[PDB]
Structure formats: C-alpha cells, structure tokens
C-alpha cells in the first residue's frame, strides 16, 4: 500500500481491464476490483463529454502519452487540492490514453500499457502519495469510501 509497486499494480490492473486482457490467476485485489468499477464509470462520462476535444489530439507514441498525461495532471492538481475523486480521474485518464494509443500508435507495441502504468504510478506516488497515506491508504481510505453500500 502506497509504495510504487502497489500503485503500479493498480494502474496495470486498470489498463488490463480496459484492454480486456486480465491476468489469469489469482485475480485482482479488493481495492483493484472497487477501483475498476468507479474509474470506468468516470472514463465513460469523460469520453462522452470531451469527445471532439479528445479527437483533436494524436497519441502516436508512449512519449506522446507520457507528455500529455503529465501536462494534464499538472493542470488538474495545480490548485493543491487532492481527494479520492481526483485520484479516480487519474485512472480514468490512463484508460482514455491507452485506448487512443491502441488506435493511433505509429509503431504498435504490445508492452506499451506497462509503460503507461509506470508513469501513472510515478505521478500518483510522487504527487499524491503523502495525502493517500494521511487519508487511510487504499484499504482504509479509498476502499472505505468507494466500496458498495
């Protein structure tokens, strides 16, 4: 919880969900299962509401995805506010990016989602990791908030 490895697994779990290529055995964690549901709901909403905007950017490489991600993330969190809903949008956005990359990547490579997962975990750990810890981590913060009633 809250170290790179844990967050990377969450990010990679979510991209495999979006890409419909789950790892067989032994399945995602409780946290990941709760996250997949809420993040996908947000992703759908965003894809609909920013369609034309998202059509006017070309995600042609992992570097394009990384730079677009980092620039968007910087602007999203520039006011210094962190909350669990904003954390969810990070996962929703990497889902949007991997889908665009699958369509638009000039040299399609199959290990790209692992690269996307990496820089997502890097951002989450370095920019929201202290907040996450202070608010209960994934199991006592995120899951407690978002798990079913």
């Amino acid at each position: 919880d809250c170290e790179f490895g844990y967050i990377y697994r969450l990010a990679q779990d979510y991209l495999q969900c979006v890409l419909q290529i789950p790892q067989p055995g032994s399945g995602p964690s409780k946290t990941s299962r709760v996250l997949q549901n809420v993040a996908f709901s947000v992703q759908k909403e965003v894809e609909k509401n920013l369609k034309s905007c998202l059509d006017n950017v070309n995600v042609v490489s992992v570097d394009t995805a990384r730079t677009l991600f980092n620039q968007v993330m910087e602007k999203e969190f520039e006011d210094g506010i962190i909350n669990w809903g904003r954390i969810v949008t990070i996962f929703a956005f990497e889902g949007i990016l991997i889908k665009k990359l699958l369509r638009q990547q000039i040299a399609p490579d199959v290990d790209t989602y692992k690269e996307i997962s990496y820089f997502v975990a890097e951002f989450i750990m370095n920019n929201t990791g202290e907040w996450i810890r202070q608010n209960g981590g994934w199991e006592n913060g995120f899951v407690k908030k978002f798990e079913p009633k």
Binding site: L50, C53, V57, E76, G85, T89, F93
Partner: peptide, 26 residues
Amino acid sequence: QEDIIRNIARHLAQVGDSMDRSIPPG
C-alpha cells in the same frame, strides 16, 4: 485557439470533485 490540455484538466478536476462530494463519509 482552444487549449486541449487545460480543457481536459479542467473537466477531470470538476468530475473528480463532483464524484468525491457524491459519496458521503463512509
């Protein structure tokens, strides 16, 4: 012209803040 980066960032912040408020303290 329309700033793609800021428009995406602005929307994600709004949706994140909106959803966060939607789920009460539980």
